[PDB]
Nucleic acid binder design. Sequence first.
DNA 1: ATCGATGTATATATCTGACACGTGCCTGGAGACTAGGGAGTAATCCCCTTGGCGGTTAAAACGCGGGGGACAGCGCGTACGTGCGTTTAAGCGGTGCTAGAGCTGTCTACGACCAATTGAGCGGCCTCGGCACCGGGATTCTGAT
DNA 2: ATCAGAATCCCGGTGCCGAGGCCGCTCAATTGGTCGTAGACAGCTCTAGCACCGCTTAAACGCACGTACGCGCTGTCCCCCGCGTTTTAACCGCCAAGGGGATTACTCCCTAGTCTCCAGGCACGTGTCAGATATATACATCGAT
Lengths: 93, 93, 107, 107, 95, 95, 78, 78
Amino acid sequence: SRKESYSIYVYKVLKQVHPDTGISSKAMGIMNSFVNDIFERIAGEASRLAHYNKRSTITSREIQTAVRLLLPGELAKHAVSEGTKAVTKYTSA
Amino acid sequence: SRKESYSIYVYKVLKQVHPDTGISSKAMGIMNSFVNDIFERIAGEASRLAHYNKRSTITSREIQTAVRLLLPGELAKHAVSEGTKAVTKYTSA
Amino acid sequence: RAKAKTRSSRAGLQFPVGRVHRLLRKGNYSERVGAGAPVYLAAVLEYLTAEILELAGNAARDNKKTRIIPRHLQLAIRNDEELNKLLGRVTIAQGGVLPNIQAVLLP
Amino acid sequence: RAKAKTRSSRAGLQFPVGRVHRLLRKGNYSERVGAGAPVYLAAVLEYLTAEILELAGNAARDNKKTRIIPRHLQLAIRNDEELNKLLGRVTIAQGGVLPNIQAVLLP
Amino acid sequence: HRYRPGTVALREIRRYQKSTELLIRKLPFQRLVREIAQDFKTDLRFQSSAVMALQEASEAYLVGLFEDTNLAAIHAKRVTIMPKDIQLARRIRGE
Amino acid sequence: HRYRPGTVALREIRRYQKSTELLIRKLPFQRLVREIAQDFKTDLRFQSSAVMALQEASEAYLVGLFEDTNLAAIHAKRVTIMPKDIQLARRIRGE
Amino acid sequence: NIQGITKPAIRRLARRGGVKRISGLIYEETRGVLKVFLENVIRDAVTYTEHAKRKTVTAMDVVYALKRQGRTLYGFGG
Amino acid sequence: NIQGITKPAIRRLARRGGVKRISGLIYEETRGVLKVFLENVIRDAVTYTEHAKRKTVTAMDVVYALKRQGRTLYGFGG
DNA sequence: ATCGATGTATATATCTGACACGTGCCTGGAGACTAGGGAGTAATCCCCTTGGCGGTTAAAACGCGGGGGACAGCGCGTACGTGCGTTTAAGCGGTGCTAGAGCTGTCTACGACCAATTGAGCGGCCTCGGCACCGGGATTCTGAT
DNA sequence: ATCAGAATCCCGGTGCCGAGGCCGCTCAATTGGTCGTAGACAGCTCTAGCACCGCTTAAACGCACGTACGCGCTGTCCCCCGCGTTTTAACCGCCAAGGGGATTACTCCCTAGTCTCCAGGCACGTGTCAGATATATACATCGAT
């Protein structure tokens, strides 16, 4: 039975920000729970927004608005910057 | 533009429990908000239960469990009784 | 064909089973919806509505009124421990508060 | 056909865009999911993870440790007002608390 | 005739706890709402019901806070509410 | 040699606020969990991780409550926490 | 405009809250608290308005902001 | 079994909470509070277990109960 | 007691606008039939929960002395409640106009879906280095003098 | 200030076990193509939000004054802290068993999807009666003597 997790990607990010720093299994579990939680929060807010506006599609606008509503202050500002940059790069292949 | 509401049914129930008692528009709006809120709570809990158990269908068991989780004490007990009675009668046409 | 018989009438309910079913299917809750779920949900909603309305009508009668107002609804909800717990984080517009003065403040 | 290029690599991300997309489609959130939504969500998740990990690594280095533990994560989250607000109602297992003694209790 | 301190206060408590009307003036509250909203977006319009909803929520919130502040005051063996009481109530509430 | 009242208390505060291990004994806590669960369903088994999660949550909750209780006590110009302080904290929290 | 929330108004609110005696600094403290609350709610409501490509903050927007801030309001359409 | 939560344990918890002096009635108050909290969480966890037709309360069940009571726990699978 | 002021409840009469009923229509729900796939059920296997034994040691229980903190009483002075005269702007009612919410029609871009491919991610195995435990010297800090 | 003693911090050595890396495989994401539809955009309507003027009057505001309450100080006594000694049961390790949780395979029945129809529910309209307001009054409560 294969059980998916965000361990690999969290580790990549860790190696990018702190090349010589590792992580314990407990801390990895914490990170996985955190990622799942934030995912749920954002997706749920986007879903509510879509329903409120009688739309059937969750788009980058919905994600952006959810981020602004949930993340406080500069967290939101930088998250929005990151998301926009990523979307632009993706759209330009 | 037609805007659906629970006014008719709330009024029917009122006439059943208090034949000589009416209701103001403000109170009706309150009742509508109440019904919508409770609906959302139960449906969301049933959805979570289904997802947790890797099921794709929301059934009467999911509704019952959601009710048990949300409604406190005898509210839950009697609500469960009502739901079970209704389901039985419906299934027996 | 046969005369249309509503699911509400089949279940002995006043709340709309068909409407509840539609709201479940279009509310992004699950892929599929069982036949008994709308009936059960409608019955629960009806029961809760009946409870609140009955208590509010009683409060109105005690206030020598024949029409239920938000005040009466607030009184009914706040005077019942269980209903208050269920509706703890809810604000009733034009409901006011329960008369409560701390004993230490009395003359 | 052409060599498979991941959407993560197309977006310059480490987080799995395809997986995020699948989770959105199968999470009972909406009928349809735009192509940009998983990219945006993945980027946001990545940013938040990077921030927390950076602060935790800093705390670890301050503690002469080379491995991040729940304690370090708790320190990083609680010492940042914004992160604390975001994670207000969250309990980090084996995280402990911040050293805080009221001034009135000191000798 | 002069009523002793406390009598009129208790009469006001009873009256306002029995009544349900809004206690803040509508026009000043509306002006406050618009001034605050101005910092987020310019040329913002407002529904009458939107302003009314805001007023209702604000009044409910403040009444609840004053209740907790009062409890704090009695806890400190006082009958007068103070800023330290408001601060304690809010801190404990998690705000 | 006898340390004056308060010194060892403050040392314990510092030690436990610096450490992270669980402070309730595992076996007694487990027994409590099982006894409480018995009233809801009989012949119930329990995962070790389930019991550990319960312990972590309970300890966190109690620490937070003691923090609020301490604040209440200080507010009442006392340094000793009392049941009235716990009651006030819980009441304001909405519990 | 914050001064429009006069001392008598704050007193009335306190009376509904069961307060018998009020200190003079309570009015300024209350004004600050109300300002913070209002800012948060209005911010979220405006976010909803902007997402809807609207120029008018609606009661529904306000209701949603309150709901997501854990202050569900009954009586204004949800 | 509630007596298994001994006075020293409660003292340690208070120390982590920054408490310097403790009244003698605090131990009984704390025991009661803890009992209530546990009852609520366990009730919900058992409800989840019964819905899954299981006989073993899982960590996931506990996590869900805590989450729905607004006490999200990280570290035990969600 | 007690009486006087005084606010508040209560009882009755006019009006008025808001709620309860009727009507026409239209669109969403009901009857009927279909396919197909999700869930129910039965067998299997293995892992992980429960139960028991023993020792041993760390933690809990108990006793005791005392000091410091809770708490009650008292005095004072000042800040807040009450009442009254003045002024200020909120409220209400009418009227204007224009911005923008809301609806309809059209069409094109975009996301669901589907089949073939394959490479990314997971399970399992192995090892070495970070950390933990132990012990001993250094430094800090506390309290009695 | 001093000094002794108790606690914590730090420094070094040894070991051990868990994190990091590697490898096989398999199934979930990618690519390429098709097709329906949803939402983006244009355009028109008409609702309601904003701006203003005027009059009225009720609420706010400023001030005077008295007194009840917040707060500081003092004394007392009790009960919680801190430490030494005894007891007990928590924890660790080790072993045994079995029961139930997860997995797989087969089947069947239950729900989505489509069509056709029709009745219930929802805008629009109206009328009449419950409640709001006004006034007089009775009654209970607060206060000073």
